[PDB]
Amino acid sequence: HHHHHHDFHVEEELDWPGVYLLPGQVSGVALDSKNNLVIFHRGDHVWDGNSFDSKFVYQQRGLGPIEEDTILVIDPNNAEILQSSGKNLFYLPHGLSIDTDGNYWVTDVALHQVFKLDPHSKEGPLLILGRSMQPGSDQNHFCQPTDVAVEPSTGAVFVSDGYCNSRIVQFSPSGKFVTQWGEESSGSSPRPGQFSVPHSLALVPHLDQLCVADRENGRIQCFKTDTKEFVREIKHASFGRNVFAISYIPGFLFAVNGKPYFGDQEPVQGFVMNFSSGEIIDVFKPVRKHFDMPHDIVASEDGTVYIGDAHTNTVWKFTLTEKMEHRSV
Ligand SMILES: O=C(N[C@@H](O)C(=O)O)c1ccccc1
Ligand SMILES: [Ca+2]
Ligand SMILES: [Hg+2]
Ligand SMILES: [Hg+2]
Numbered sequence: 001h002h003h004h005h006h007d008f009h010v011e012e013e014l015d016w017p018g019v020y021l022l023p024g025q026v027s028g029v030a031l032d033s034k035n036n037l038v039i040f041h042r043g044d045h046v047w048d049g050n051s052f053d054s055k056f057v058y059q060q061r062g063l064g065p066i067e068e069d070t071i072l073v074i075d076p077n078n079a080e081i082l083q084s085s086g087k088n089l090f091y092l093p094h095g096l097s098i099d100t101d102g103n104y105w106v107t108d109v110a111l112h113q114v115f116k117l118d119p120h121s122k123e124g125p126l127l128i129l130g131r132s133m134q135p136g137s138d139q140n141h142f143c144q145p146t147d148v149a150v151e152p153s154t155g156a157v158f159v160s161d162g163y164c165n166s167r168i169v170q171f172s173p174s175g176k177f178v179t180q181w182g183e184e185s186s187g188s189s190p191r192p193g194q195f196s197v198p199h200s201l202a203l204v205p206h207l208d209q210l211c212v213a214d215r216e217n218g219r220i221q222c223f224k225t226d227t228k229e230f231v232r233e234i235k236h237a238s239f240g241r242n243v244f245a246i247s248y249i250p251g252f253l254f255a256v257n258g259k260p261y262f263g264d265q266e267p268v269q270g271f272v273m274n275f276s277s278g279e280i281i282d283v284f285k286p287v288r289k290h291f292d293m294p295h296d297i298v299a300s301e302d303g304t305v306y307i308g309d310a311h312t313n314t315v316w317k318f319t320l321t322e323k324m325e326h327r328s329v
Contacts, residue, residue, distance in 0.1 A: 006281035007322045010272055010305060012288065016317040018079035019288050023072070026308030026315050028096030028106075029296045032119075036082060037074040037298075037306050039315055040096035040106060042066065047092055047109065047310075056135045056143060056164045058091060058110040066090050071104060073119075076304065076317075085119065095147035095160075096296070097201075105148035105157070112142045114159055127175045129159065137165055139177040149201035149210065151225060158210060160198035168198060168212065168223075181228045190217045192230040200245040200296070202253070204275075211253070213243040220246055220255065234278045240266035245297045247305075251275055252320075254305055256294040268294060270307060272320070286316045 018037070028040030043066040053059055069084030070093055091110030098104055103126065104117040113130035135143040144163030150156070155173040170178040185194035196216035203210055208225045218241050220234040234253070242258025255271040268291040272282040285291055292311035299305045303320040
């Protein structure tokens, strides 16, 4: 054959019934070791105009925590709910990732905290990072923290401290502050090592890298995991104004962008990139329902991709595929 757009295409898996789930705002997705989908959602709680004040202190405390199960593990085939937890803990759930031991790492924008959770415990968090409901910028505080990444080989814990800070903080396995890097993207053009809302983390296990979705700058920044050296910047006109979430599997970087402003050419979409060259090789969207705020993305080596939306309260399963002739060319 000839013409050379990529033969790789991501399509919604239509026989997955998880799209019919009615959670709250889906803020986080992850895969466990048995390849189940794990979602983190806000139940009846919404991040809205009344949630915070000028100084980033949560305003709906008298309403209490989310009283329903906030973390659900979902079957990859029939989408049945295998387990649930996280009841009466969280206020505005944000990030979720799972380490190699199977612990849930979780982030709360209202509490300004990060939690490590044993999924089989009925005793509560193993570790809590941050000060309850208290925003800050020093070693013991967060300011609307957004994501967590935990390196399998060292145990090092990385937290993107994002919506009101511009840093990535490293912690010990025991939760001691080790180091930190990043600053606000300065006036004129944003420069290497400067974030405007670090919003999502992807580890690259065997290339010693840590990628950050730089939300308000519409770019992805990659750093050496040990020396914090800026490695590379990924930015495309197709992204538009925002990059909400990234996820890595060997060979690929998956990303998800923001909903366009009135006037913008670039639709909301999922992106597949060749990890080496950085180039977009495919662009995709669901058949059922629609993207509004696709908010987190995870991919598996088996070629499965999951995306959760924070405005349409939906999670979708897609599969990566290479066809001799892309469905419909
Ligand atoms: O996009 C926002 N929130 C989402 O990421 C979310 O729902 O988590 C946001 C909007 C206004 C102010 C601050 C944050
Ligand atoms: Ca995640
Ligand atoms: Hg081809
Ligand atoms: Hg967010």
